[PDB]
Amino acid sequence: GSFVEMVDNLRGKSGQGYYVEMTVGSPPQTLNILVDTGSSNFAVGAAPHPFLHRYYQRQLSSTYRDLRKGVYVPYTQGKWEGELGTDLVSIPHGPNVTVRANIAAITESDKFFINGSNWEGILGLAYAEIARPDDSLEPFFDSLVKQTHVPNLFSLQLCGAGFPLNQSEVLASVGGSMIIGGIDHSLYTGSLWYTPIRREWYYEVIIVRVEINGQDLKMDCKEYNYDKSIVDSGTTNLRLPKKVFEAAVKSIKAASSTEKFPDGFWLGEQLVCWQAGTTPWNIFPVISLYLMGEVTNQSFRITILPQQYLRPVEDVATSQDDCYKFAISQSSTGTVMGAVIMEGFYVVFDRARKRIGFAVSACHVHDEFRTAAVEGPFVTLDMEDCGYNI
Ligand SMILES: CN1C(=N)N[C@](C)(c2cc(-c3cccc(C#N)c3)cs2)CC1=O
């Protein structure tokens, strides 16, 4: 590991997201910021809110600059309104540099901030194409690279605990690492395998084959990327296009048929519990996603375990049972490789070489019989045909 100052700088969990500490303004105002590769705006709470115990106070920053422009950002569920401006920003447990970046000061919001959560803003790490209001608002990472000598690359190791973390524990626990400008070898084992970034807007990739316990889902590969497939640290679940989700659930149900689970479980609505320590990991299948490789007609696969797709949750009766929710769900906006996938791997967002690397995470949860994996290469033809076009 060559980046000790940044190792273990994240906190959180898949259900609440993972955040890094940042400072904004002069003198510096400390805030916890959600690390989100699924968006491109740096936005922070800038007004009192019931679920925030601190926020950005522009009037107390001598380096604050008003851009005199508002921004409205609506999401599937939730939305916020803010005022655009710039200020000096730093990451305490990050590169030792300070940069002037755009900041959306959130003044009004609805179902955005989460009661119980510990973050006060979001750091959109994706590209300008999807920034709001438009691509003219330079994203934080672009500013960082343009203003310093930090290499145009970052890597993320999200660490699921494998069990529930209570309010106090989740605040004291190490949730992972965000290495800005490099790759830390202590965070993974084995080799890194890279897939191309198809287009620079979201971190879009192309899935070319899917297997459930080695059995080919056997769908037209275009279905797996309809209408796109992205890597998003800001999404909890592994989300799959409707048809792919239906086929995957049918296969996962068949593989785990020795035990029957209620429809509510497969819908990700209700939890299932087992006596402490007896979770039947072995009856659930591993899931492999094959991704386009960097060499023509070559692909590689990343394999996750149920320890990744069954999200630990505290039981309603806070019993001693080990409980989980099914963390694979349907999407009408393409495949989303969320925390479920990311917790199994160290993921390298190599913007400089327009590629995303995957390696088995040194902190992935597993058992004595199976482990997550990243393996290759495999001969795969016409992978370009797997990509979707409107
Ligand atoms: C999916 N996705 C995204 N990646 N980023 C956006 C900005 C947002 C993510 C969150 C959010 C909140 C809490 C936990 C997690 C988690 N985990 C993500 C709130 S807005 C919009 C969106 O819909």
Coordinates of C-alpha atoms and ligand atoms in Angstrom, one line a residue:
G1 CA 0.0 0.0 0.0
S2 CA 1.5 3.3 -1.2
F3 CA -1.4 5.5 0.0
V4 CA -1.6 5.1 3.7
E5 CA -3.0 8.6 4.3
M6 CA -6.1 7.6 2.3
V7 CA -6.5 4.0 3.3
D8 CA -9.6 3.5 5.6
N9 CA -10.9 7.0 5.0
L10 CA -14.6 5.9 4.4
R11 CA -17.4 5.2 6.8
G12 CA -21.0 3.9 6.3
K13 CA -22.7 0.9 4.8
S14 CA -24.5 -0.1 1.6
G15 CA -28.0 0.8 2.9
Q16 CA -26.9 4.3 3.9
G17 CA -24.1 4.9 1.4
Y18 CA -20.4 5.4 2.1
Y19 CA -18.9 8.9 2.9
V20 CA -15.6 10.6 3.2
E21 CA -14.7 13.7 5.3
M22 CA -14.2 16.9 3.4
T23 CA -13.8 20.6 4.3
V24 CA -15.2 23.6 2.5
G25 CA -14.5 27.3 2.9
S26 CA -12.0 29.4 4.9
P27 CA -11.6 28.7 7.7
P28 CA -12.4 25.1 6.8
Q29 CA -15.9 23.7 7.6
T30 CA -15.9 20.0 8.0
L31 CA -18.7 17.9 6.4
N32 CA -19.3 14.2 5.7
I33 CA -19.8 13.6 2.0
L34 CA -21.3 10.7 0.2
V35 CA -19.0 9.2 -2.4
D36 CA -21.2 8.8 -5.5
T37 CA -19.9 7.5 -8.9
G38 CA -23.5 7.8 -10.2
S39 CA -23.8 11.6 -10.3
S40 CA -21.6 14.6 -11.1
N41 CA -22.5 17.4 -8.7
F42 CA -20.8 18.4 -5.4
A43 CA -23.8 19.5 -3.3
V44 CA -23.9 20.1 0.4
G45 CA -26.6 21.0 2.8
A46 CA -26.3 24.8 3.3
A47 CA -29.3 25.5 5.6
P48 CA -30.7 24.1 8.8
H49 CA -32.5 20.8 8.5
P50 CA -34.0 18.4 11.0
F51 CA -31.7 15.5 9.9
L52 CA -28.5 17.6 9.7
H53 CA -26.5 18.6 12.7
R54 CA -24.2 20.8 10.6
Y55 CA -24.1 22.4 7.2
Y56 CA -22.2 24.7 5.0
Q57 CA -22.4 28.4 6.1
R58 CA -21.4 30.5 3.2
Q59 CA -21.4 33.7 5.2
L60 CA -18.6 32.4 7.4
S61 CA -16.3 31.6 4.5
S62 CA -14.0 34.4 3.2
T63 CA -13.3 32.5 0.0
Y64 CA -16.9 31.8 -0.9
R65 CA -17.9 33.1 -4.4
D66 CA -21.5 33.4 -5.4
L67 CA -22.3 32.2 -9.0
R68 CA -25.7 33.9 -8.8
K69 CA -27.5 30.9 -10.3
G70 CA -29.9 28.4 -8.8
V71 CA -30.1 24.7 -9.6
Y72 CA -33.1 22.3 -9.3
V73 CA -32.3 18.6 -9.0
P74 CA -35.2 16.1 -8.9
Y75 CA -34.5 12.4 -8.4
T76 CA -36.8 9.3 -8.7
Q77 CA -37.5 9.8 -5.0
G78 CA -36.4 13.0 -3.4
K79 CA -35.1 16.3 -4.8
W80 CA -33.4 19.5 -3.7
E81 CA -33.0 23.1 -4.7
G82 CA -29.7 24.9 -4.3
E83 CA -27.6 27.9 -5.1
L84 CA -24.4 27.6 -7.1
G85 CA -21.1 29.0 -6.0
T86 CA -17.4 28.1 -5.6
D87 CA -15.1 27.8 -2.6
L88 CA -11.8 26.1 -1.5
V89 CA -12.3 22.4 -0.9
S90 CA -10.0 19.8 0.7
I91 CA -10.1 16.1 1.7
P92 CA -8.3 15.7 5.1
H93 CA -7.6 12.0 4.5
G94 CA -6.8 12.5 0.9
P95 CA -4.2 14.2 -1.4
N96 CA -2.6 17.1 0.4
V97 CA -4.0 19.7 -1.9
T98 CA -6.7 22.4 -1.8
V99 CA -8.8 23.3 -4.8
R100 CA -11.4 25.8 -5.9
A101 CA -14.5 23.8 -6.9
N102 CA -18.1 24.3 -7.7
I103 CA -20.5 23.8 -4.8
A104 CA -24.3 23.5 -5.0
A105 CA -25.5 24.9 -1.6
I106 CA -28.7 23.0 -0.8
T107 CA -31.3 25.4 0.6
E108 CA -34.4 23.4 0.1
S109 CA -34.9 19.6 -0.1
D110 CA -37.5 16.8 0.0
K111 CA -36.7 13.3 1.1
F112 CA -33.0 13.8 0.3
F113 CA -31.3 13.9 3.7
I114 CA -31.9 10.7 5.6
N115 CA -32.8 10.6 9.3
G116 CA -30.1 8.7 11.2
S117 CA -27.5 9.0 8.4
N118 CA -24.3 10.9 9.0
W119 CA -23.6 12.6 5.7
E120 CA -24.3 16.2 4.9
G121 CA -23.6 16.3 1.2
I122 CA -22.8 14.3 -1.9
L123 CA -19.7 14.1 -4.1
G124 CA -20.6 13.3 -7.7
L125 CA -17.6 11.6 -9.2
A126 CA -19.0 10.9 -12.7
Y127 CA -18.5 13.2 -15.8
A128 CA -19.7 16.6 -16.7
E129 CA -22.2 15.3 -19.3
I130 CA -24.6 14.5 -16.5
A131 CA -23.9 17.4 -14.2
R132 CA -26.8 19.8 -13.4
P133 CA -27.9 22.2 -14.7
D134 CA -25.7 21.3 -17.6
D135 CA -22.2 20.2 -18.6
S136 CA -20.7 23.7 -18.1
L137 CA -20.6 23.1 -14.3
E138 CA -17.2 21.5 -13.9
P139 CA -17.4 18.4 -11.5
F140 CA -15.1 18.3 -8.5
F141 CA -12.7 15.6 -9.8
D142 CA -12.2 17.6 -13.0
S143 CA -11.3 20.6 -11.0
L144 CA -9.0 18.6 -8.8
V145 CA -7.1 17.2 -11.8
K146 CA -6.9 20.5 -13.6
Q147 CA -5.7 22.4 -10.6
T148 CA -3.1 20.0 -9.2
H149 CA -0.7 17.2 -10.1
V150 CA -3.1 14.5 -8.9
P151 CA -3.3 11.6 -11.5
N152 CA -6.7 11.4 -13.3
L153 CA -7.8 8.2 -11.4
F154 CA -9.4 7.2 -8.2
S155 CA -10.2 3.8 -6.7
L156 CA -12.8 2.6 -4.2
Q157 CA -12.8 -0.2 -1.7
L158 CA -16.3 -0.3 -0.1
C159 CA -16.4 -2.7 2.9
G160 CA -19.6 -4.4 4.0
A161 CA -19.3 -5.7 7.6
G162 CA -21.2 -8.9 6.9
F163 CA -23.4 -8.2 9.8
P164 CA -25.6 -5.3 11.1
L165 CA -23.9 -2.2 12.5
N166 CA -25.8 -0.3 15.1
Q167 CA -25.9 3.5 15.3
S168 CA -22.7 3.6 17.5
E169 CA -20.9 0.9 15.6
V170 CA -21.4 2.4 12.1
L171 CA -19.9 5.6 13.4
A172 CA -16.8 3.9 14.8
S173 CA -16.3 1.3 12.1
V174 CA -14.0 1.7 9.0
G175 CA -16.2 1.5 5.9
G176 CA -13.6 1.4 3.3
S177 CA -11.1 3.4 1.2
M178 CA -11.2 6.0 -1.5
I179 CA -7.7 6.4 -2.9
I180 CA -7.5 9.7 -4.9
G181 CA -4.9 9.6 -7.6
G182 CA -3.8 6.0 -7.3
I183 CA -4.1 2.3 -6.7
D184 CA -3.2 0.9 -3.2
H185 CA -2.1 -2.8 -3.5
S186 CA -3.0 -3.6 0.1
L187 CA -6.7 -3.3 -0.7
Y188 CA -7.0 -6.3 -3.0
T189 CA -5.6 -9.8 -3.8
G190 CA -5.0 -11.3 -7.1
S191 CA -4.9 -9.4 -10.4
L192 CA -6.8 -6.4 -11.6
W193 CA -8.8 -6.9 -14.7
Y194 CA -10.0 -3.9 -16.8
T195 CA -13.2 -3.3 -18.8
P196 CA -13.5 -0.2 -21.1
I197 CA -15.5 2.8 -20.0
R198 CA -17.9 2.7 -23.0
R199 CA -18.8 6.4 -22.8
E200 CA -17.9 9.2 -20.4
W201 CA -21.1 10.3 -18.7
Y202 CA -22.0 7.7 -16.1
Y203 CA -19.2 5.2 -15.6
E204 CA -20.8 3.0 -18.3
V205 CA -19.6 -0.5 -19.0
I206 CA -20.8 -3.5 -21.1
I207 CA -21.8 -6.9 -19.6
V208 CA -21.5 -9.7 -22.1
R209 CA -22.6 -12.8 -20.2
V210 CA -24.3 -13.7 -16.9
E211 CA -24.1 -16.9 -15.0
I212 CA -25.9 -18.2 -11.9
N213 CA -23.8 -20.9 -10.3
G214 CA -22.1 -21.4 -13.7
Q215 CA -25.3 -21.7 -15.6
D216 CA -25.7 -19.3 -18.5
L217 CA -28.7 -17.0 -18.1
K218 CA -28.6 -17.3 -21.9
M219 CA -30.2 -14.0 -22.7
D220 CA -29.4 -11.8 -25.7
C221 CA -26.5 -9.9 -24.2
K222 CA -28.1 -6.6 -25.3
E223 CA -30.7 -7.2 -22.6
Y224 CA -28.0 -7.0 -19.9
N225 CA -27.2 -3.4 -21.0
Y226 CA -30.7 -2.1 -21.7
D227 CA -30.5 0.7 -21.8
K228 CA -27.1 1.0 -20.2
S229 CA -25.0 -0.7 -17.5
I230 CA -23.1 1.5 -14.9
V231 CA -20.9 1.2 -11.8
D232 CA -22.6 3.3 -9.0
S233 CA -21.3 3.6 -5.4
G234 CA -24.5 5.7 -4.8
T235 CA -26.9 2.7 -5.3
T236 CA -27.2 0.0 -2.6
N237 CA -28.4 -2.9 -4.8
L238 CA -27.3 -4.7 -7.9
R239 CA -30.1 -3.5 -10.1
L240 CA -31.0 -5.3 -13.3
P241 CA -33.3 -4.5 -16.3
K242 CA -36.8 -5.9 -15.8
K243 CA -36.4 -8.9 -18.1
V244 CA -32.9 -9.8 -16.8
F245 CA -34.1 -9.4 -13.2
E246 CA -37.0 -11.8 -13.8
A247 CA -34.7 -14.4 -15.4
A248 CA -32.1 -14.0 -12.7
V249 CA -34.6 -14.4 -9.9
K250 CA -36.1 -17.4 -11.5
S251 CA -32.6 -19.0 -11.6
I252 CA -31.6 -17.9 -8.1
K253 CA -34.9 -19.4 -6.8
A254 CA -34.2 -22.6 -8.6
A255 CA -30.7 -22.8 -7.3
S256 CA -31.9 -22.2 -3.7
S257 CA -35.1 -24.4 -4.0
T258 CA -34.3 -26.5 -0.9
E259 CA -35.8 -23.6 1.0
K260 CA -38.9 -21.6 0.1
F261 CA -38.9 -17.8 0.6
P262 CA -41.9 -15.5 0.5
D263 CA -42.5 -13.3 -2.6
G264 CA -41.8 -10.3 -0.3
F265 CA -38.3 -11.5 0.1
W266 CA -37.5 -11.7 -3.6
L267 CA -39.1 -8.2 -4.0
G268 CA -36.5 -6.9 -1.5
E269 CA -39.3 -5.8 0.8
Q270 CA -39.1 -8.2 3.7
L271 CA -36.2 -9.7 5.5
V272 CA -35.5 -13.4 6.2
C273 CA -33.9 -14.6 9.3
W274 CA -32.0 -17.6 10.6
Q275 CA -30.8 -18.7 14.0
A276 CA -27.5 -17.0 14.8
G277 CA -24.7 -18.4 12.7
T278 CA -26.8 -20.8 10.7
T279 CA -27.4 -18.7 7.5
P280 CA -27.4 -21.4 4.7
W281 CA -25.0 -19.5 2.4
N282 CA -24.3 -22.7 0.5
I283 CA -27.8 -23.1 -0.8
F284 CA -27.6 -19.7 -2.6
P285 CA -25.7 -19.5 -5.9
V286 CA -22.7 -17.3 -6.8
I287 CA -23.4 -14.8 -9.6
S288 CA -20.9 -14.1 -12.4
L289 CA -21.0 -11.0 -14.6
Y290 CA -18.7 -11.2 -17.6
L291 CA -17.4 -7.8 -18.8
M292 CA -15.9 -6.8 -22.1
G293 CA -12.1 -6.9 -21.8
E294 CA -9.5 -4.5 -23.2
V295 CA -8.3 -6.9 -25.8
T296 CA -10.4 -7.7 -28.9
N297 CA -12.8 -10.7 -28.4
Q298 CA -11.6 -11.1 -24.8
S299 CA -13.7 -10.8 -21.6
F300 CA -13.2 -11.5 -17.9
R301 CA -15.7 -12.3 -15.1
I302 CA -16.4 -11.0 -11.6
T303 CA -18.1 -13.4 -9.3
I304 CA -20.0 -12.4 -6.1
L305 CA -21.4 -14.5 -3.3
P306 CA -24.7 -14.4 -1.5
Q307 CA -22.7 -12.7 1.3
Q308 CA -22.6 -9.8 -1.1
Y309 CA -26.2 -9.9 -2.4
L310 CA -28.0 -10.7 0.9
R311 CA -27.7 -7.4 2.8
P312 CA -27.4 -7.8 6.6
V313 CA -30.2 -6.0 8.5
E314 CA -31.2 -5.8 12.1
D315 CA -34.2 -7.9 13.1
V316 CA -37.4 -6.0 14.0
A317 CA -37.1 -7.7 17.4
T318 CA -33.4 -7.0 17.6
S319 CA -33.2 -10.8 18.3
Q320 CA -30.0 -12.8 18.1
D321 CA -31.0 -14.1 14.6
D322 CA -28.9 -13.2 11.6
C323 CA -31.3 -11.5 9.1
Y324 CA -31.0 -10.1 5.6
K325 CA -32.8 -8.5 2.7
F326 CA -32.4 -9.6 -0.9
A327 CA -30.3 -6.8 -2.5
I328 CA -30.9 -7.5 -6.2
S329 CA -33.8 -5.5 -7.7
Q330 CA -35.3 -4.5 -11.0
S331 CA -34.6 -1.3 -12.9
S332 CA -36.2 0.5 -15.8
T333 CA -33.0 2.4 -16.4
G334 CA -30.5 -0.3 -17.1
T335 CA -28.1 -2.3 -15.0
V336 CA -26.7 -0.7 -11.9
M337 CA -23.7 -2.3 -10.2
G338 CA -24.2 -0.8 -6.8
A339 CA -22.7 -1.4 -3.4
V340 CA -23.7 -5.1 -3.7
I341 CA -21.2 -5.6 -6.4
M342 CA -18.7 -3.0 -5.2
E343 CA -18.3 -4.6 -1.7
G344 CA -16.9 -7.7 -3.3
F345 CA -14.2 -5.8 -5.2
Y346 CA -11.6 -3.1 -5.2
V347 CA -12.7 -0.9 -8.1
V348 CA -10.3 1.3 -10.1
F349 CA -11.9 4.2 -11.9
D350 CA -9.0 4.8 -14.4
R351 CA -10.3 8.0 -16.1
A352 CA -6.9 8.6 -17.7
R353 CA -7.1 5.3 -19.6
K354 CA -10.9 5.3 -20.0
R355 CA -11.2 2.0 -18.1
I356 CA -12.5 0.5 -14.9
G357 CA -10.5 -2.2 -13.1
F358 CA -11.8 -4.9 -10.8
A359 CA -9.9 -7.1 -8.3
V360 CA -11.1 -9.3 -5.4
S361 CA -11.4 -7.0 -2.4
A362 CA -9.3 -7.6 0.7
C363 CA -12.4 -6.8 2.7
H364 CA -15.1 -8.8 1.0
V365 CA -17.2 -11.1 3.2
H366 CA -17.1 -14.8 2.4
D367 CA -17.0 -18.3 4.1
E368 CA -14.5 -21.1 4.2
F369 CA -15.8 -22.7 1.1
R370 CA -16.2 -19.9 -1.5
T371 CA -14.7 -16.5 -2.2
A372 CA -15.5 -13.7 -4.6
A373 CA -13.4 -13.8 -7.8
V374 CA -12.1 -11.9 -10.8
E375 CA -10.9 -14.2 -13.5
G376 CA -9.9 -14.3 -17.1
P377 CA -9.5 -14.2 -20.0
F378 CA -12.4 -15.8 -21.9
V379 CA -12.9 -15.8 -25.7
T380 CA -16.1 -13.7 -26.4
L381 CA -17.3 -12.7 -29.8
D382 CA -19.3 -9.7 -31.0
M383 CA -19.2 -7.9 -27.7
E384 CA -19.9 -4.6 -29.3
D385 CA -23.3 -6.0 -30.1
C386 CA -24.0 -6.2 -26.4
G387 CA -24.1 -2.4 -26.1
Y388 CA -27.5 -0.7 -26.4
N389 CA -28.2 2.2 -28.8
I390 CA -31.4 4.4 -28.7
Ligands
LIG1 C1 -28.9 6.3 -7.7 N1 -28.5 7.7 -7.5 C2 -27.2 8.1 -7.4 N2 -26.2 7.3 -7.6 N3 -26.9 9.4 -6.9 C3 -28.0 10.3 -6.5 C4 -27.4 11.8 -6.7 C5 -28.4 10.1 -5.1 C6 -28.0 9.1 -4.2 C7 -28.6 9.2 -2.9 C8 -28.3 8.3 -1.8 C9 -28.8 8.5 -0.5 C10 -28.6 7.6 0.6 C11 -27.9 6.4 0.3 C12 -27.4 6.1 -1.0 C13 -26.7 4.9 -1.3 N4 -26.2 3.9 -1.6 C14 -27.7 7.1 -2.1 C15 -29.4 10.4 -2.8 S1 -29.5 11.2 -4.3 C16 -29.2 10.1 -7.4 C17 -29.6 8.6 -7.6 O1 -30.7 8.3 -7.9

